Every structure is written in structure tokens, then in C-alpha cells.
Write a protein that binds this ligand. Structure first.
Ligand SMILES: [Zn+2]
Lengths: 83, 73, 73, 53, 302, 73, 144, 195
DNA sequence: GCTTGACAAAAGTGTTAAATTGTGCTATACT
DNA sequence: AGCACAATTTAACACTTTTGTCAAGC
């Protein structure tokens, strides 16, 4: 009473996961390999709702306004032009 | 006494600055909590609470703080 | 050849407990707001009693009294 | 098929039972819907009252 | 020989900055980052730079990352001075150090040079948080979340303060009062704080604790055999029932399949209503309760 | 519950009980008269480690006649 | 079977180790502090190592022996005997290689004898007390 | 590095050792070691001979010498390193789990530092820590001071299972406790027949 | 030996509030 | 330590279906 779905991890390995036929199959499955993988059948519905992580640039922007950054880069280049 | 003997070694406590000194002295015991028979029954340990006089001194301000301290049973 | 008796075996375990506390007393002074420090705020007695409790239990010189007869004890 | 906003109980039963398009719904028989699991009277009462609207 | 000695040797090779350099490095870091973000802005909409403008932009970024690395390496001594105090608490000294460095890294990222404050002032905050936050996620074999570690510690201090005021240890009531929580809760918290013990401890003085533990799921031979014998006596007693009478009992309790069935489901196989099956069930059960059938199964009570 | 166990329940009408039986019994090969009993209850004020509501100790005693296999000297 | 002929050993390769593994345990977590149930992705994780109870998945949607050898689409636990919890292995994928201490520190050092490095020198390399020349360009060094 | 860096590559850690094995000719070092045992008899010959025993062992077997460096570490099944609550609810577990915990903790921190970017001092420190933790897991105290728990007692490594009178072989394999057995004190049988 | 309808308990199912859990941060100076 | 806030999980609950049960009658 089971249906078998196959997933493919980003590195190319493929894995067989037996499921119950009555149950709804997922589009991604944590795999014995340790990586996420994608079902080779139709869907494959969803992005999973990725929000980008916080970056150093983000933390600098919230204090220095872009103008202050520009004048600073001005100070720095005008110093490089003088050799 | 052995207790005072190890307390002499501690007194005083002084950082590299010598600006503050924490001094110990005068150990004291109260009467035993419970009797031997009572402890063997109630699964406790036969013990007297110990008390100490702790003197903290600030060399900059020259202030003294004397406090009685409970070491334990 | 000695022969450290019970009083001394306790003294040594107390000495250890105090030295472990002196460490917290010394460092405590530094990060504590000065003039807000008291003999108590610098003193944390956890390591002193632990030495005693951890000596009577788990130590090979502290044994369950052997009593099947007065002579054994 | 989602313009109906059927009560979440009705949408899941139909979606599990395999009615993707309303074209598959109208062909089904009223006795065929109530045999679908966890599909009761209040389900066909909400679906019928909305179909009539 | 020691691993911490090895790490201290290397962090000692760098040199401590003064206030002026810290500001210098800070600027280089922010300049490099903005240089990078702008160039990346060109990547999407194109508009390539003049050659001299591009070659120098590449250098601003490289110089910024060179700055970030120099600020860190110069303050590694600060991490170590903070992590010294948190040892003996259940984390390795090196692990404290490394986690402090992670806080040091965010200090650098989030540090602001315009405020005119010395770097160690703002960095001490992050390094301490990184180290204590680390201990709360790590130091316990069974992890407790930070909010619970927070309270477990608070309860500890209250007990030590209350201990000093009462010349004794406080009861659960005194503790729950000083902490403004229910006494039942403080018990729950004190159970959470219990830490596990090693199955490898030698208690014999000479055998290890771990080998005194029974296996509670191990099969017991006398029961599995009697269960086999019980499975025999039922098969017999059922044979004294009508074909449908026995068939209904088996499906009702799931003897053959192991999956019990509803009255409506058994009515579906024999072609009757659930109520009919309920009736047939009552009858065969009073037949089964009849002493001649039940007398043999009595000793299987348990 | 196992199906074979649930059928006997219906027949003899003993409800499968909500709880397992973990009970104190005398070790294999031991015997005697019950001497005394000590009960510590959380309901009663008493005292106990966190989580322990009630503690009961039972003292069994026996007269041992000198027996073949006993060691003398 | 109880009759086997040979029993052999060899160095387990990373690939051998990965093939044994029923999953990569990604967290240093044992069991939840409240429910005392195995934490997912940690040591003891039922998704990888196996079910705590016979033919019972973590969440329990499939509780019955009726379907053995199917995986719960919710908790990803396989329905089978909890005995497999005794037979099944995981793995950790390292972010940097690591030397097997048996072959480095065994006397005589196998690595030392294999690369012809003095053991006291081999130590300095793996523990980051000194560098080692991995490659040199002989032509480019000569032409320049 | 700054001058000549373009002409060579160098590194530290097992990552470098892996490279030296990656570029290795056993058949080459085989014979080139084979002649030195013929021509150079002396104390060096005694050295080259022993060294041959390992280099030769890898030729005949199909074993890649790469195996001596680990990209992945296996994890033993949970019931062999159990965690269980005793009577009363207090918990006891194998030392193996805290040992596995240090390894995975340090590997995960390493991933973190790699992604941020970090000065080699910090990153190399992690790799050195990662290396030592996998050592303690396999064989504890075989290098340096052993990883200890409370009371300063060293944790039991995977090697500690097999070795010694209390290890698997002597304790659980060459002997064992058995069913259908008993014992008591013995008394004289003077009236017994010999059988 | 059987079925019908009224019916209440039981069992699921979706919808929401409460709790639990995870993460960011704290700017005298401190190496 | 301590807090704030977002994220996630757990409980609580309203509500719908199903299951067992009774009386009454074909
Ligand atoms: Zn499940």
C-alpha cells in the first residue's frame, strides 16, 4: 500500500523514498545524503518562502546614510589619486 | 584552630591594585541543627552552621563594610 | 611518614573550597560597581560547601562505617 | 474552482476526492459526495446554498 | 604542547591599536563595503566603469576586507580576557574563546566610529553576550532554550541570596515568593535543571553503572509462549461459534488482520446494518461469557 | 492493547486500566516479618527532592538459625 | 545464517561511511527537555536512526503494522521494528578534512611512514603549527 | 608568499595532508624505495625497510590511502550509546554523546566562520579544535590530556569499548553471563557416589 | 431475522488564542 | 541578565462527521 517517489539533491544523487499511496507526496525531502532534494514528478510546486539573511552592508546602511558613505569614498579616492 | 589556620591564609583578599581588601576572621558555629538520631531517620547530615566576619575595605575611600557571612552547614 | 588525620583531611578540603572562592572574590571586585560591593556581593559560597559535601561523598578516605559488631566499628 | 471559497472542510474533501474543476463537481451525484470521507450534511448544505446563489 | 598556548602565541603576534587607528580601520571597512555595493549596483544595470575607476574600486574593497581582518586580529586578546571567567561552567575554554570571536565579529560589523567611543567599550558587550548566549545553547547535554536557562539562573541567585538572609536553604514556598511564581512552577524548574549522569561511571570499587540497566522492551520467553498458547485456545473456542458469529468477533477485534473494524464495516462484509452487527455481537458475547467457553481462558487474565 | 488481550477484556468485562503496575515486592530468596514502616509524604509537610511526593520505607527482619553452609571460626 | 566463511577489514572511505549512513545528524541535540522525545536532526533522531516504538512513527499518523516499510510523509520516520534503532548509523559531513588519529599517532605513524615525514613534524602540520609545501611549479620557477 | 606565491602552493592541517596523498605514486615510491633497500644497506636500510611495509601494504590491497583522512565521520546507532532515565527519573547517558556533541558543535561553528569570512587565525583555530574533538571521539587521551567530565574523569572513547579486560572481547565475547545457572556454598558429600 | 430514525457519545477537523522558542541587542573603558 | 519582538508550537475551542446504542417495528 505504498507509492515510491524519487528526489534529486543539488549534487546529482537520487534517492528512493517509499510513501503510502493515499498520502500527499512532498516536493522536497530531507535525504539520507544530508541535503534537500526535488521530486522528479510534476510538482515541484513551491519556492518555500526564502527571506534573504542579514548582511554586513545592511548593518552599515542603517547607520551611515548613502551620502555620508559617498563623501567618505570621496575622501578615500582623492587620497589614492595623490601618490 | 584548623579553621582559623586556613582563614589566616585567606586574609586579606587584595587585587593587584591593593585598592580594596576583603578580610576574614572569627569563625562561629551555632548549635547542631538536628540530633544524630533525627538525621539518620530523615536522611540529613549532622551539621552546625558556620558563621564568619567579612571585612571589605576601600583604600581609595577609606570606608569599611563589616558583614556577617554564612559559610554553610 | 604521616598520617594526615581527619581534621587535616577536612582542612585541606576547606582550603581548596576557599581558594576557589577567592578567585570569584578577586574577579568580582573588577566588574562590580565600586562602593556597591559588600563582603556578600563578592562572596559566593557554592565552592566552599561543595568541597565538604564532595569530600564526604565520592572520597575513598570517607567510608560507610563498618558495623556488624562493635569491634568492626 | 476556488472562486467558491468553500468552507475549509469542503475544499479539502473535494480536493482529496479529486474534483479539480467544477465541471467534475456537477457531474458527481449527491450520494457520491456524501460517501467521500468526512463529508457530511452541513457540507452539502453550504455547497448547495452557494451553488444556488 | 597545549592547544590554548598555541592559540595565545599567534594572537600575541599582532599589535594593539590605539584610538586613532581603530577609527582609521573603521572608515576603510565602511568605504570598502559601499564601494562593493555600488559596483554590484552596476552589475545589474551595467554601465561599466572607466579602467582607472574600476581598478581603484577593486582596491577599495580589497582594502576594506583587509581592514576588517586587521581590526579583528588586533582585538583577539580582548575575547580571551573575557572568556577566562566563564570556564569551569561546562564549556571548553577554546569553545568559549571561539564563540567570543563570533561576538567580536558582529561588534566590528555593527561598530560606529562617529560616536567617538573606544572600540573595547562597544565590543565588550557583544563578546559577553556571544559567550553567555553560547553557554545556554551548548553547555547542557540536554539543551534548554535561552528563556528557560534565563529563569533557571534567576532561581539560582534568589536561592543564594535567600540562603544568605535566612541562614539556611529556602523552601519552595520562600523561593516561589521571592520570584513571584507558583511553588509548583519552581519544582518544575528544579526538575528541568537536573543534569544527566554517565552510564560509564564505575560504581563498583569494579563495574560500570551502564551494565546494571535492564532492557524493559526485551521479550520475555514465558509470556510469548503463553501468548502463543492463548492464541491457540481462542482459535479453539471460536470454533464453537457459528461461522458468522466467529467471523464477526474476529473482524470486530481485528484478530486476523490486527486492524479492528467498526460495526458499519463488519455490516458491509455480511450485508447488514451496523445495528444488526451490534446485535450479533451482544449474543455471541453472552455465548462467549457462557462458562463452558470462558472457563478455559480465565487463567489468561494477566 | 493486543487484539487477543482486548477480546478477553470484553468477555470478562475487566476494563483495561489506565496505569501500569510498578510496585515494591520482596527480592527473590528473602523472607521475614515486617518490623516497622516509615512514610514521608509531600501532602504532609515533610520534605523531599523536587518531583518526589511520597516516600515509604519498609523494614523486614528475620531470625536466622545456624544453618548448614554458614561459616564459623 | 550462522555459517560465514571469511571476515574482512579495510579502511572505510568517506563514501563507504556515507553509504552506511541513514542520514546526516546536523544538531548536537539529544532529547527535548520537556517532552523527553528525540529531537529531530540530532543524535537519536527518529527520522534517521529509527522509530522509538514498533511500527510507530514519531507523530503517529501511521501507527499500525498494516503498512511496514513506508515512511511518514509528515515526520519522515519509517514504520518498522524499533530494533533498527540498534542497527542503524548516521554520519557527519565535515567542513574541513580530519586525520584519523589511529593512523597518525600510532607507533610507528602510518602517515609518517607513507609520506616519509617525521612524526613530530607530521603533528605540526595537522595541528596547524607549521605549513607544508603542497605544490611547486618547476618550469615557472626555472624560466624566471 | 607575496614574492614567489605564484610559483608554489602550501597549507596546514589535514586538508594539506590530503593533498600530499592526492599527489602520490605508490608504485613510484614503491620501487624507488625498493632500490634504496638494495643499494644503501645500513641504518637507513632498516628505516627504508620498515617504511616499505606500509607502502607495500597499500599496493596489493585496493585500499586508497586517502582513507586515513576523513571527510565524513560515522555515527554509532543510538541504542549502543543510550540515554535512559533510571528509577526515579534522573537521566544517565553514554560519554559518546558529549563526545559526538563537541565534534558536531565545532563542525557547525566552522561552517559559520567560513561563510562570514574570517581571518585564518580564527578559522585555523576552529580546524585545530575540530581535529582534536574527532581524536577524543575515536581515541581519548591518546594525544594530550583526555577530555574529562565532572570530577575530572576522562570520557570513554570508541577505542575504550574494545580494549582491556572490560572491553567487548574479554568482557562480552570470550566470556559472558549465562542463563540456567546458579551457585552456593559447598559442603562435604561423604555419602555420595562419585558421579 | 432484520431495518429504521432519533440520538448522544466519540472522534476528527479547522480556526484561534496562548505559550513556547529563537534571535538581536546593550556605546566610559576594559586587549 | 534581561528584555523585545518575530517566529513557531501547543492548547483550546467551535463545529462536523462518525460511531455505538436504544426503542420500536417490519
Ligand atoms: Zn509520522
Amino acid at each position: 500500500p505504498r507509492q515510491v517517489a524519487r528526489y534529486r539533491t543539488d549534487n546529482g544523487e537520487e534517492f528512493d523514498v517509499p510513501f503510502a499511496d493515499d498520502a500527499e507526496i512532498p516536493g522536497t525531502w530531507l535525504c539520507r545524503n544530508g541535503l534537500e532534494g526535488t521530486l522528479i514528478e510534476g510538482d515541484v510546486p513551491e519556492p518555500k518562502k526564502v527571506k534573504p539573511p542579514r548582511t554586513h552592508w545592511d548593518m552599515l546602511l542603517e547607520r551611515r546614510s548613502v551620502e555620508e558613505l559617498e563623501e567618505l569614498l570621496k575622501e578615500r579616492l582623492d587620497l589614492i589619486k595623490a601618490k | 584552630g584548623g579553621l582559623e589556620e586556613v582563614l589566616a591564609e585567606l586574609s586579606p583578599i587584595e587585587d593587584f591594585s591593593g585598592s580594596m581588601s576583603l578580610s576574614f576572621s572569627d569563625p562561629r558555629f551555632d548549635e547542631v541543627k538536628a540530633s544524630v538520631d533525627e538525621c539518620k531517620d530523615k536522611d540529613m547530615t549532622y551539621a552546625a552552621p558556620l558563621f564568619v566576619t567579612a571585612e571589605f575595605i576601600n583604600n581609595n575611600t577609606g570606608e569599611i563594610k563589616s558583614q556577617t557571612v554564612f559559610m554553610g552547614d | 611518614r604521616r598520617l594526615r588525620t581527619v581534621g587535616e583531611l577536612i582542612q585541606n578540603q576547606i582550603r581548596v573550597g576557599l581558594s576557589r572562592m577567592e578567585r570569584v572574590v578577586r574577579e568580582r571586585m573588577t566588574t562590580q560597581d565600586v562602593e556597591a560591593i559588600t563582603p556578600q556581593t563578592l562572596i559566593n559560597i557554592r565552592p566552599v560547601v561543595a568541597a565538604i559535601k564532595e569530600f564526604f561523598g565520592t572520597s575513598q578516605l570517607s567510608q560507610f562505617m563498618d558495623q556488624n559488631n562493635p569491634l568492626s566499628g | 474552482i476556488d472562486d467558491l471559497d468553500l468552507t475549509v472542510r469542503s475544499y479539502n474533501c473535494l480536493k482529496r476526492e479529486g474534483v479539480h474543476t467544477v465541471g467534475e463537481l456537477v457531474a458527481r451525484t449527491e450520494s457520491d459526495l456524501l460517501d467521500i470521507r468526512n463529508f457530511g450534511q452541513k457540507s452539502i448544505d453550504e455547497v448547495k446554498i452557494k451553488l444556488h446563489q | 604542547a597545549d592547544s590554548v598556548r598555541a592559540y595565545l602565541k599567534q594572537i600575541g603576534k599582532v599589535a594593539l591599536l590605539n584610538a586613532e587607528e581603530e577609527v582609521e580601520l573603521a572608515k576603510r571597512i565602511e568605504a570598502g563595503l559601499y564601494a562593493t555595493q555600488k559596483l554590484a549596483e552596476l552589475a545589474e544595470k551595467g554601465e561599466k566603469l572607466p579602467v582607472q575607476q574600476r581598478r581603484d574600486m577593486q582596491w577599495i574593497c580589497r582594502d576594506g576586507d583587509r581592514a576588517k581582518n586587521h581590526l579583528l586580529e588586533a582585538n583577539l586578546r580582548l575575547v580571551v580576557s573575557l572568556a577566562k571567567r566563564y570556564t569551569g561552567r561546562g564549556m571548553a575554554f577554546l569553545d568559549l574563546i571561539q564563540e567570543g570571536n563570533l561576538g567580536l565579529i558582529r561588534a566590528v560589523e555593527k561598530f560606529d566610529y562617529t560616536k567617538g567611543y573606544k572600540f573595547s567599550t562597544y565590543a565588550t558587550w557583544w563578546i559577553r553576550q556571544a559567550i553567555t548566549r553560547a553557554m545556554a545553547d551548548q553547555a547542557r547535554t540536554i539543551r534548554i532554550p535561552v528563556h528557560m536557562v534565563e529563569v533557571i539562573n534567576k532561581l539560582g541567585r534568589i536561592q543564594r541570596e535567600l540562603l544568605q538572609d535566612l541562614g539556611r536553604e529556602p523552601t519552595p514556598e520562600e523561593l516561589a515568593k521571592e520570584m513571584d511564581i507558583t511553588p509548583e512552577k519552581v519544582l518544575e524548574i528544579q526538575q528541568y535543571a537536573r543534569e544527566p549522569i554517565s552510564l560509564d561511571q564505575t560504581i563498583g570499587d569494579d563495574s560500570q553503572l551502564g551494565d546494571f540497566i535492564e532492557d524493559s522492551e526485551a521479550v520475555v520467553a514465558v509470556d510469548a509462549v503463553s501468548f502463543t498458547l492463548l492464541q491457540d485456545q481462542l482459535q479453539s473456542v471460536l470454533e464453537t461459534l457459528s461461522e458468522r458469529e466467529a467471523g464477526v468477533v474476529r473482524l470486530r477485534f481485528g484478530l486476523t488482520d490486527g486492524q479492528p473494524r467498526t460495526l458499519d464495516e463488519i455490516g458491509q462484509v455480511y450485508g447488514v446494518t451496523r445495528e444488526r452487527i451490534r446485535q450479533i455481537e451482544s449474543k455471541t458475547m453472552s455465548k462467549l461469557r457462557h462458562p463452558s467457553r470462558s472457563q478455559v481462558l480465565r487463567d489468561y487474565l494477566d | 492493547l493486543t487484539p487477543e488481550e482486548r477480546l478477553l477484556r470484553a468477555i470478562f468485562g475487566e476494563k483495561a486500566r489506565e496505569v501500569r503496575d510498578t510496585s515494591l515486592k520482596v527480592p527473590h530468596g528473602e523472607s521475614g516479618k515486617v518490623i516497622g514502616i516509615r512514610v514521608f509524604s509531600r501532602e504532609d509537610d515533610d520534605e523531599l527532592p523536587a518531583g518526589v511526593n511520597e516516600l515509604v520505607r519498609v523494614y523486614v527482619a528475620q531470625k536466622r538459625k545456624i544453618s548448614d553452609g554458614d561459616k564459623l571460626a | 545464517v550462522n555459517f560465514f566463511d571469511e571476515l574482512r577489514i579495510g579502511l572505510a572511505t568517506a563514501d563507504d561511511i556515507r553509504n552506511w549512513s541513514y542520514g546526516e545528524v546536523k544538531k548536537p541535540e539529544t532529547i527535548n527537555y520537556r517532552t523527553l522525545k528525540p529531537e529531530k536532526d540530532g543524535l537519536f533522531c527518529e527520522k534517521i536512526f529509527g522509530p522509538t516504538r514498533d511500527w510507530e512513527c514519531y507523530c503517529g499518523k501511521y501507527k499500525r503494522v498494516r503498512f511496514k516499510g513506508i515512511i511518514c510523509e509528515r515526520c519522515g520516520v519509517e514504520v518498522t521494528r524499533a530494533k533498527v534503532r540498534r542497527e542503524r548509523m548516521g554520519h557527519i559531513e565535515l567542513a574541513a578534512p580530519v586525520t584519523h588519529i589511529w593512523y597518525f599517532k600510532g607507533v610507528p605513524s602510518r602517515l609518517g611512514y607513507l609520506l616519509d615525514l617525521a612524526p613530530k613534524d607530521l603533528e605540526k602540520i595537522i595541528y596547524f603549527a607549521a605549513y607544508v609545501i603542497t605544490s611547486v611549479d618547476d618550469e615557472m620557477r626555472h624560466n624566471e | 608568499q607575496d614574492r614567489y606565491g605564484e610559483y608554489f602552493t602550501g597549507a596546514m592541517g589535514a586538508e594539506s595532508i590530503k593533498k600530499l596523498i592526492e599527489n602520490f605514486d605508490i608504485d613510484a615510491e614503491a620501487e624507488s624505495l625498493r632500490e634504496v633497500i638494495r643499494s644503501g644497506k645500513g641504518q637507513k636500510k632498516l628505516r627504508a625497510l620498515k617504511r616499505l611495509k606500509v607502502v607495500a601494504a597499500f599496493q596489493q590491497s585496493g585500499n586508497s590511502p586517502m582513507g586515513m583522512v576523513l571527510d565524513a565521520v560515522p555515527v554509532i546507532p543510538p541504542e549502543l550509546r543510550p540515554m535512559v532515565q533510571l528509577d526515579g527519573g534522573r537521566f544517565a547517558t553514554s560519554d559518546l554523546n558529549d563526545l559526538y556533541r563537541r565534534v558536531i558543535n565545532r563542525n557547525n561553528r566552522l561552517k559559520r566562520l567560513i561563510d562570514l569570512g574570517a581571518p585564518e587565525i580564527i578559522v585555523n583555530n576552529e580546524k585545530r579544535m575540530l581535529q582534536e574533538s574527532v581524536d577524543a571521539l575515536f581515541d581519548n587521551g591518546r594525544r594530550g590530556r583526555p577530555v574529562t567530565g565532572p570530577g575530572n574523569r576522562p570520557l570513554k572513547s570508541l577505542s575504550d569499548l574494545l580494549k582491556g579486560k572490560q572491553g567487548r572481547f574479554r568482557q562480552n565475547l570470550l566470556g559472558k553471563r549465562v542463563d540456567y545457572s546458579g551457585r552456593s556454598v559447598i559442603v562435604v558429600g561423604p555419602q555420595l557416589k562419585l558421579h
